[PDB]
């Protein structure tokens, strides 16, 4: 247990250093191993913000692909939790997208219990899809203001 405590402390310190440096791809792996939800949420969040300026970035996208079954279970429990909240679903939607684009869709199915997690992801995703689409519809006001301006 001393050796495990020794290794665990080093992982914490390395994780903090990576986050300050912005090395999200290495931070993502450490957070996944350490099971740090905020650091797991924050690495993905601010990594996405950099992406705004394929899905997240080449290095991190590879990192998510290499995840074996176990971390895929832990990661997608978090996405299910994040998806429920409308302020944090966007992070979940991009993470789940990267999983489908970088894994064998036969394989994810046989992993035990994943249907049940996938079951909970659909209803909230549909609710969000019903949303935003409404925002797009009532965003066309900008056209009506413009055409009235044109007259």
């Amino acid at each position: 247990e001393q050796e495990k405590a020794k290794l665990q402390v080093e992982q914490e310190q390395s994780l903090q250093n990576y986050m300050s440096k912005g090395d999200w791809t290495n931070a993502f792996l450490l957070a996944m191993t350490l099971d740090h939800p905020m650091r797991l949420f924050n690495v993905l969040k601010r990594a996405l913000g950099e992406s705004r300026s394929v899905i997240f970035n080449e290095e991190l996208d590879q990192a998510i692909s290499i995840l074996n079954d176990e971390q895929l279970i832990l990661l997608m429990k978090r996405c299910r939790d994040w998806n429920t909240n409308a302020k944090t679903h966007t992070i979940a939607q991009r993470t789940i997208r990267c999983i489908l684009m970088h894994h064998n869709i036969a394989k994810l199915s046989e992993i035990p219990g994943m249907v049940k997690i996938v079951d909970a992801i659909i209803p909230y995703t549909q609710r969000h899809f019903t949303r935003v689409d409404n925002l797009v519809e009532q965003s066309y006001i900008l056209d009506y203001a413009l055409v009235e301006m044109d007259k």
Binding site: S14, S53, L100, V136
Partner: protein, 816 residues
């Protein structure tokens, strides 16, 4: 009545804090409880006394006992001293001005240690609160603080501003960059707590709870992200007890560096760093030995790593004292000899000198040239008495009795004695009479400076208490054998007259000044009062939870006060033995209670270290006095009653001498400042083709957009509702700039869409009316970029729902 104040404090040469040594053979700063002291080791006299102020007993003086000094650091460059007290306050002291310069209060706990930076501009502090704060002396403020350590900081090391090493109670050594205010690497020095950290160039040494001492190589410029500090080997120090502090001393002529580990036990270990040549020279024989042994070259390398710590360092010598060394510090470095000064818990300062030639010391054992014990009581002063003249006070302690004059505050004569429990003056102050725990009776003549006669078998059991008649002819002994023995002086020698058997031991014996009555305290919680002349039972006092520790009799002699471990002081009338009233004066037991002479007023001292000034008639406390950190053991009152002396387990004896913007504008005001700023930046850019915001340290677009987040949504629709259109155009210009930066838009896209789209609803008629073409261009750019962001999210959501639906549908086929 007339208030009681403390004239002075004396008797404590060294308190519980580090020693600070200055060369001139070398003067030493020694803590004196809250007070700070400078002694000269060679002469042994006290050069001066440094008092913060607020003399004890003053009304302005705080009730709570003054914080004691935990750490002391004197700066040679600036000739300034910083003091760290128990409460955590740091006071800057000037040695020449003899007064505090600056006051710093950033630690809620006492300070583990303090270190002035080499420049003197800043000081680094490490406190038991696990907070490391750096204060600028010129700024008088704490620049920054470090929290990551989970427990008290036993030590820290900062030669260079760029990097700091911190050792902490939790066992973690953490490298800190002062510039970034963050830790970069963490390693556990010991599974136990790391008490002492010392750094010598690359070499770093840590002592944990268990004997093993770990040697660490540090290279700052590694830039590997790992292993800035690496442990090369582990060496066991001889003492099982932990090492509290570590220090390094380097001899200039030969550059050899020696270091000592100061253990909790009396033993102190000193170690010597080998030169590189002798180490490489030494390794060569070892290799040759193993070749002779026949061990494999891989095993040869194994032996080298196992003994690698032995190669680096060489044991030098051990220092042992009579009493445990709370703190110790190097004094003098020379090739011929070294000298180290140590301070023990027993209030003595000892200066140790060691001569060494080549590898090992020349002397068989260390020798101490000077020892400071003239004004120090080796053990706590058990009983204190004041002579009839009151000039001289006697302090009875284990292995030592001393009689100190109030004016000098120093000993005149010192007498060797046993574990004395009761001390008394004979009439005229000529002789002092004490009772040991063994039960032997000790009688000293102050003028003779030696004992007159000892009666070993005068009493078999411990002499718990002793009291004398006013004439002094008759002496009464109360003790554990449960028999009271009366002794008569005959020319001066002591002779037993009679013994009175009692069912229980006499914890305390008191005789009235008129000598009409005699009082006995018993472990049965029953106080028996006898006529002194007739030796017959008179009255009894009952009801104390625990045995009464002290009994006192008033001048009028109608009053008896009894203090007990029940923590209630009770006031009993002698005439009929009735209790007039009972007081819970002190939370803890009241060891001793005394009547002020020629007054019904009585003084009380207890283990909680309080001295209280209580009137019997009023039955309430006149005044409360705290000056002793530890329990006050006994209290003695002068014959005049002007001054009362008290002694405590802290080995300090003290004389007490009688003398808002509602919603809406926060969006308006924020909008005005940010838009005005962006317009200025745009105008400046066009030319090439505020202070509050700088304090905020956010972009003008971020600052307002943060203000939107702070505003509650339920009030938001009305905040937008109150908006005048001139500000709406400002708001529209605000968004278009947000639209330029994609990351900010995506972060809070849903909020933005709702804000723009409602405000257009309310003012849609005056938007269309506006004839500004560039405004239309602003609207167009906002629309297009807003579409792309929303479309991107919808595409993301649309993809996922289809793919996940597919995964569920495929699994259903497999299991159906």
């Amino acid at each position: 009545y007339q208030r009681f104040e403390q004239a002075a404090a004396f008797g404590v040469i060294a308190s519980n804090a580090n020693c600070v040594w200055i060369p001139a053979p070398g003067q030493l700063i020694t803590s004196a409880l809250e007070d700070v002291n400078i002694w000269d080791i060679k002469t042994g006299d006290l050069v001066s006394k440094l008092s913060d102020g607020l003399p004890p007993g003053a009304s302005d003086a705080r009730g709570a006992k003054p914080a004691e000094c935990t750490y002391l650091e004197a700066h040679k460059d600036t000739d300034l001293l910083a003091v760290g007290y128990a409460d955590g306050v740091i006071k800057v002291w000037d040695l020449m001005s003899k007064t505090v310069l600056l006051n710093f209060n950033g630690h809620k706990a006492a300070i583990t240690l303090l270190q002035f930076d080499g420049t003197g501009t800043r000081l680094i502090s490490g406190s038991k609160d696990s907070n490391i704060i750096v204060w600028d002396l010129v700024g008088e403020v704490g620049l920054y603080k470090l929290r990551s350590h989970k427990d008290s900081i036993t030590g820290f090391w900062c030669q260079g501003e760029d990097w700091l090493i911190s050792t902490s109670k939790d066992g973690m050594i953490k490298l800190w960059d002062l510039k970034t205010h963050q830790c970069i690497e963490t390693h556990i020095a010991h599974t136990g707590e790391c008490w002492g950290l010392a750094v010598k160039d690359d070499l770093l040494i840590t002592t944990g709870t268990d004997s093993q001492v770990k040697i660490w190589k540090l290279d700052i410029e590694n830039d590997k992200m790992g292993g800035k500090l690496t442990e090369m080997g582990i060496f066991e120090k001889q003492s099982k007890q932990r090492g509290l502090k570590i220090e390094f001393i380097t001899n200039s002529s030969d550059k050899t560096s020696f270091f000592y580990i100061q253990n909790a036990d009396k033993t102190i270990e000193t170690f010597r760093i080998r030169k590189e040549e002798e180490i490489a020279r030494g390794l060569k024989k070892r290799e040759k030995r193993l070749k002779e042994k026949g061990l494999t070259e891989e095993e040869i390398a194994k032996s080298i790593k196992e003994s690698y710590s032995s190669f680096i360092l060489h044991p030098f010598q051990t220092i042992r004292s009579l009493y445990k060394i709370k703190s110790a510090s190097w004094t003098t470095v020379s090739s011929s000899k070294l000298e180290l000064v140590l301070t023990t818990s027993s209030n003595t300062i000892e200066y140790y000198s060691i001569p060494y030639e080549k590898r090992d010391p020349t002397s068989p054992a260390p020798l101490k040239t000077h020892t400071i014990e003239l004004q120090g009581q080796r053990t706590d002063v058990r009983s204190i008495d004041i002579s009839d003249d009151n000039k001289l006070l006697a302090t009875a302690s284990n292995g030592s009795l001393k009689i100190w004059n109030i004016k000098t505050h120093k000993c005149i004569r010192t007498f060797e004695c046993g574990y004395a429990l009761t001390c008394k003056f004979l009439p005229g102050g000529l002789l002092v009479i004490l009772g040991t725990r063994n039960g032997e009776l000790q009688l000293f003549d102050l003028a003779s400076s030696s004992l007159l006669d000892t009666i070993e078998d005068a009493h078999d059991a411990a002499i718990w208490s002793l009291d004398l008649t006013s004439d002094g002819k008759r002496l009464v002994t109360g003790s554990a054998d449960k028999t009271v023995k009366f002794w008569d002086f005959k020319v001066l020698k002591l002779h037993h007259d009679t013994t009175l058997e009692l069912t229980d031991d006499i914890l305390c014996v008191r005789v009235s000044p008129d000598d009409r009555y005699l009082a006995i305290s018993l472990l049965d919680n029953t106080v028996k009062v006898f006529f002194l002349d007739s030796m017959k039972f008179y009255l009894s006092l009952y009801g104390h939870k625990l045995p009464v520790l002290s009994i006192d009799i008033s001048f009028d002699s109608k009053m008896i006060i009894t203090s007990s471990a029940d923590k209630n002081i009770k006031i009993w009338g002698l005439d009929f033995g009735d209790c007039h009233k009972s007081l819970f004066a002190h939370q803890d037991s009241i060891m001793n209670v005394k009547f002020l002479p020629q007054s019904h007023n009585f003084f009380s001292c207890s283990k909680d270290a309080v001295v209280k000034y209580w009137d019997g008639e009023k039955f309430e406390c006149i005044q409360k006095l705290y000056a002793h950190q530890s329990e006050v053991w006994a209290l003695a009152v002068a014959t005049d009653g002007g001054f009362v002396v008290s002694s405590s387990h802290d080995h300090s004896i003290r004389i007490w001498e009688e003398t808002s913007l509602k919603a809406g504008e926060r969006l308006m005001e924020a909008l005005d400042l940010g838009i005005a700023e962006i317009e200025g930046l745009e105008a400046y850019n066009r030319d090439m083709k505020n202070a509050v915001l700088i304090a905020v340290n956010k972009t003008p677009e971020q600052y307002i957009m943060d203000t939107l987040l702070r505003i509650r949504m339920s009030q938001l629709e009305d905040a937008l509702m109150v908006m005048p259109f001139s500000y709406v155009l400002k708001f529209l210009k605000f968004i278009d700039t947000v639209m330029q930066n994609k990351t900010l838009l995506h972060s809070h896209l849903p909020l933005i869409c709702k804000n723009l789209f409602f405000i257009i609803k309310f003012n849609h008629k005056e938007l269309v009316s506006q004839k500004n073409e560039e405004l239309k261009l602003q609207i167009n750019r906002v629309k297009t970029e807003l579409r792309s962001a929303l479309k991107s999210t919808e595409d993301d959501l649309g993809f996922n729902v289809q793919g996940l639906k597919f995964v569920k549908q495929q699994w259903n086929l497999r299991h159906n």
